[PDB]
Amino acid sequence: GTENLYFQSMARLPKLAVFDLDYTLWPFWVDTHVDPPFHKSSDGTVRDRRGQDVRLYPEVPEVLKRLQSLGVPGAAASRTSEIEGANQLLELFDLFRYFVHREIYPGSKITHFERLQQKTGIPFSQMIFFDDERRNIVDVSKLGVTCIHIQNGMNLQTLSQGLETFAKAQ
């Protein structure tokens, strides 16, 4: 039936997709490997104050568009010390629209997740989380979040695999 297909499809999806920043959305540490502030050049390339190029992993825009097409809102959770620079990159890559709720500061990821739950009201069991660091996957899984370990940046295959893992885990 049409309503059954619709509601079953809705129920299989996470209610929040949480992303780390460094090595998840972009291939570097924002507090170490680049020299802020940043700007977008006339050719459309974002660069740091020494003229070094800064970009997202190539499939990140498509990944985030796909989540949006599925109705899954986003959040950011990063321990970077370069908070201003991280927020400037979110602006320059046109990602603030997707990442409404953000915990960007040094600290425990368990603290980040507590604060994201407060800001969104979403139970941990209805969250999915993508992170390059296995230790974060181990820790945040203890809260009941479905945690997907990233290798070599976020991409479409990782998103697909993650969503299926989440759907099976219910």
Swiss-Prot record:
Cofactor: Mg(2+)
Cysteine pairings via disulfide bonds: none
Entry's EC annotation: 3.1.3.-, 3.1.3.48
UniProt keyword annotations, A-Z: Hydrolase, Magnesium, Metal-binding, Protein phosphatase
Record entry for activity regulation: Inhibited by vanadate and zinc, and slightly by calcium.
Active site: 20, 22
GO-annotated molecular function: acid phosphatase activity; metal ion binding; protein tyrosine phosphatase activity
Alphabetized Pfam families for the sequence: Acid_PPase
The protein's name: Magnesium-dependent phosphatase 1
Binding site for substrate: 29, 79
Catalytic activity as recorded in UniProt: O-phospho-L-tyrosyl-[protein] + H2O = L-tyrosyl-[protein] + phosphate
